[PDB]
Design an enzyme around this catalytic site. Structure first.
Site, PDB file in Angstrom:
ATOM      1  N   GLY D  69       0.802  -1.207   0.000  1.00  0.00           N
ATOM      2  CA  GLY D  69       0.000   0.000   0.000  1.00  0.00           C
ATOM      3  C   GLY D  69       0.838   1.261   0.000  1.00  0.00           C
ATOM      4  N   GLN D  70       2.123   1.120  -0.313  1.00  0.00           N
ATOM      5  CA  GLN D  70       3.018   2.264  -0.355  1.00  0.00           C
ATOM      6  C   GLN D  70       2.678   3.166  -1.537  1.00  0.00           C
TER       7      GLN D  70
END
Ligand code: GTP
Ligand code: MG
Lengths: 18, 177, 415, 180
Positions: D69-70
């Site tokens: 989810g970066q």
């Protein structure tokens, strides 16, 4: 036989040097 | 050609992926610009076969400068491969990490370099020393910040005399520049 | 400290390249061919090229030029040694050195190149070690490379422990046109093909002049080699300490020691040439060969090459012993003899015409060289004393060795 | 043509199926994938790139491609969207500030014509604290009930406990495979 000199047996060390 | 190769690489067949990798390697050696297919091969990078892993690493190294943006999808793969039980895989990963000319790639590889600095395998130690020397040559400031000089100096006074010689050569190269 | 080592082709195409440092662009290989062409056409061609601030050192291979581009002041000797090691590894892995195998083993060639050196510093150089970890038809790296003994792999088992040695003798004679020998050096070669079980440590012992003097037996025939080079497995410490040639024999054929000293004896074959060359009319080849070696030794496959005229044609050979064949490609007549017993005297009388039109430019006077090779002959007189084969398990070895005498740089200057 | 080989393969099980691992960072997507593949709560570094793994259940090898989810890895999920049959969204019920970001990412992923055959797979991650919502509040906040032409189901799964992963896997198998 083999060209370039037949193979000869080799010793282990100089037996006359102790 | 290119579309067929991309379709083969985007498949789940190991034989087809190996054939596509071999074709890409042959095209690259023959003088074919295969850098456009680098993002496609990024997904087909984490493979159990060692032959495909070496080809993928070579393609990434040869396609790292051409597509630095597309090289950001290999940091996780490199981190995963840096802890591989096989010494050959770890050495290949260490060599590929130092061979990638990415400014933002070596920053995230400092932790793997530190982990591999104390590798027990003499080949692993030599690979870690080579990677540290490559990082120092690429970024002397990064090497100094990571504190690899102390590790390189201590590698000289250890076992793995070939690894000791590699570390000594790396230290001399760092001091040479 | 070469930036990247690559293999070129006869047409300038790079068969395979592998960058090691990345400080040199891969496009510099294209300009290497024009630079080499310019150097060849002007006589300034050298193995170490220079493209601006980057030096492209290349070695003339069998079919491709192993160009190793470099940028900084890297070790030229180190680069040459790395190139020689790579060539030896390729020859061991591939029996042919040409474009057929360059593009046929690329998958394994790239892996071998990557494993051999990293960042310009070679790491793996043992052919057996490289083959034990990288194959064309992968496990963890062998412990032999990490271990101190990198020239004797442990765990090798054989049904019989037989080692075949080869006492190779190279008789090089530099006889000037005046009839005197200038460079007369004989280089020994003690190569043994050890094939046994385990990792025995060979204890080499011969009738060395230095060893005989040290032991007090400096009264018999002892070989005093001016330059003696030990093999990689040979321990230099023992040799420097008391001339003890103790080292682990390698698995296969390897060169343990190679003597190199000057020769002060008469040449094995004495060849005198007579050039009765007429002025654009005919040519005479009064070639007489005298065997200066012992009569008990026969020079098998003796080929005394006599350079004939470049434009000479319609030649006639009038010899006594040995067939004479004129090869237009070689532009010379070789006095080939199947068996040349010592003390034999062979006389030849060549006769051929010449074109009426004189040559536009001179062709030079290449020296006359012979290809005599008399086996079972020890010109130097050095006799091997013993070979100390010791194994931890304990076995009875049966080493063998043969003495071969051949002609090396035995060139006689033309008149 | 003959389909005897296909019938023989299907008699003992030949279907495998696919799955996707997407969601916000620290949402248990990597933990969920590890539990599906291995079955233990192992601490791992953040997924800078992507994680590829396969889980075999009910004679079907549902491979899940974990995606971080970066910010630098959020736009990289489009690479795995090609030749992908499933899509799993990892929700963070314990991250109220990141709940909006996760919902926006899920809407962006579901707003692509390429990702149309993959049904919605929302897992209520972080189901170990009292602050976690139920299976209806999270769906209502994310608006999964208004996603027409998508088989989206809200399931609560706790990475530490492992409960609810079997229900999510069964729901995904039912959405993908519609046979006996
Ligand atoms: N300790 C704990 N952590 C949980 C729990 N549920 C969800 N998590 C989260 O799951 C995360 C596990 O991290 P990862 O394995 O990297 O997986 P991730 O959540 O997708 O994070 P990224 O991979 O970086 O995207 C932790 O950071 C937690 O924030 C739980 O019940 N207990
Ligand atoms: Mg993850």
């Amino acid at each position: 036989d083999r060209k370039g000199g037949s193979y000869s047996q080799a010793a282990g060390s100089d037996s006359a040097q102790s | 050609e290119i579309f067929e190769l991309k379709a083969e690489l985007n498949s789940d067949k190991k034989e087809k992926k190996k054939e596509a990798v071999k074709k890409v390697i042959a095209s690259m050696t023959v003088g074919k610009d295969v850098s456009a297919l680098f993002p496609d091969v990024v997904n087909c990078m984490q493979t159990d076969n060692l032959e495909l892993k070496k080809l993928v690493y070579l393609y990434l190294m040869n396609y790292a400068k051409s597509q630095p943006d597309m090289a950001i999808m290999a940091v996780n793969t490199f981190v995963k491969d840096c802890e591989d039980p096989n010494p050959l895989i770890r050495a290949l990963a260490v060599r590929t990490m130092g061979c990638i000319r990415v400014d933002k790639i070596t920053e995230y590889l400092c932790e793997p370099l530190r982990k591999c600095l104390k590798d027990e395998d003499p080949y692993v130690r030599k690979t870690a020393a080579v990677c540290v020397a490559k990082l120092h040559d690429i970024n002397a400031q990064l090497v100094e910040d990571q504190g690899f000089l102390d590790t390189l100096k201590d590698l000289i006074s250890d076992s793995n005399p070939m690894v000791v010689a590699n570390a000594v050569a790396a230290l001399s190269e760092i001091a040479e520049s | 400290s070469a930036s990247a080592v690559y293999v070129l082709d006869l047409k300038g195409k790079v068969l395979i390249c592998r960058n090691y440092r990345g400080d040199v662009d891969m496009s510099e290989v294209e300009h290497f061919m024009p630079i080499l062409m310019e150097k060849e056409e002007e006589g300034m061609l050298s193995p170490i090229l220079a493209h601006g601030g980057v030096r492209f050192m290349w070695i003339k291979h069998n079919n491709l030029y192993l160009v190793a581009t470099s940028k900084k002041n890297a070790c030229v000797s180190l680069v040459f040694s790395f190139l020689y090691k790579v060539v030896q590894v390729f020859s061991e892995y591939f029996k042919e050195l040409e474009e057929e195998s360059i593009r046929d083993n690329f998958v394994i060639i790239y892996e071998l190149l990557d494993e051999l050196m990293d960042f310009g510093y070679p790491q793996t150089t043992d052919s057996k070690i490289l083959q034990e970890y990288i194959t064309q038809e992968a496990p963890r790296p062998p412990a032999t490379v990490t271990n101190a003994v990198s020239w004797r792999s442990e765990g090798i088992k054989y049904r019989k422990n037989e080692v075949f040695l080869d006492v190779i003798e190279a008789v090089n004679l530099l006889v000037s046109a005046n009839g005197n020998v200038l460079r007369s050096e004989i280089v020994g070669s003690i190569k043994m093909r050890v094939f046994l079980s385990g990792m025995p440590e060979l204890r080499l012992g011969l009738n060395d002049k230095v060893l005989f003097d040290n032991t007090g037996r400096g009264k018999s025939k002892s070989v005093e080699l001016e330059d003696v080079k030990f093999h990689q497995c040979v321990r230099l410490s023992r040799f420097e300490n008391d001339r003890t040639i103790s080292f682990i024999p390698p698995d296969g054929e390897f060169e343990l020691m190679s003597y190199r000293l000057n020769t002060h004896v008469k040449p094995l074959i004495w060849i005198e040439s007579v050039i009765e060359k007429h002025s654009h009319s005919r040519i005479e080849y009064m070639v007489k060969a005298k065997s200066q070696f012992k009569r008990r030794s026969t020079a098998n496959n003796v080929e005394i090459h006599i350079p004939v005229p470049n434009d000479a044609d319609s030649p006639k050979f009038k010899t006594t012993v040995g067939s004479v064949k004129w090869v237009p490609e070689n532009s010379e007549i070789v006095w080939s003899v199947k068996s040349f017993p010592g003390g034999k005297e062979y006389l030849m009388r060549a006769h051929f015409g010449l074109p009426s039109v004189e040559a536009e430019d001179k062709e030079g006077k290449p020296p006359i060289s012979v290809k005599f090779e008399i086996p079972y002959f020890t010109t130097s007189g050095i006799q091997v004393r013993y070979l100390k084969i010791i194994e931890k398990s304990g076995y009875q070895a049966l080493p063998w060795v043969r003495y071969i005498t051949q002609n090396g740089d035995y060139q006689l200057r033309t008149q | 043509g003959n389909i005897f080989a296909n019938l023989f393969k299907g008699l003992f099980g030949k279907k495998e199926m696919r799955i996707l691992m997407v969601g916000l960072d620290a949402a248990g997507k990597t933990t969920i994938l590890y539990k599906l593949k291995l079955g233990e709560i192992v601490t791992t570094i953040p997924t800078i790139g992507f994680n590829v793994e396969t889980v075999e259940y009910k004679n079907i090898s549902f491979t899940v491609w974990d995606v971080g989810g970066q910010d630098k890895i959020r736009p990289l999920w489009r690479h795995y969207f090609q030749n992908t049959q499933g899509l799993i969204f990892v929700v963070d019920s314990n991250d109220r500030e990141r709940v909006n970001e996760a919902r926006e990412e899920l809407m962006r992923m579901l707003a692509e014509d390429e990702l149309r055959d993959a049904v919605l797979l929302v897992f209520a991650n972080k189901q170990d604290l009292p602050n976690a919502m139920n299976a209806a509040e999270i769906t209502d906040k994310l608006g999964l009930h208004s996603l027409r032409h998508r088989n989206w189901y809200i399931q609560a799964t706790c990475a530490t406990s492992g409960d609810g992963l079997y229900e999510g896997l069964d729901w995904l198998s039912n959405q993908l495979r519609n046979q006996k």
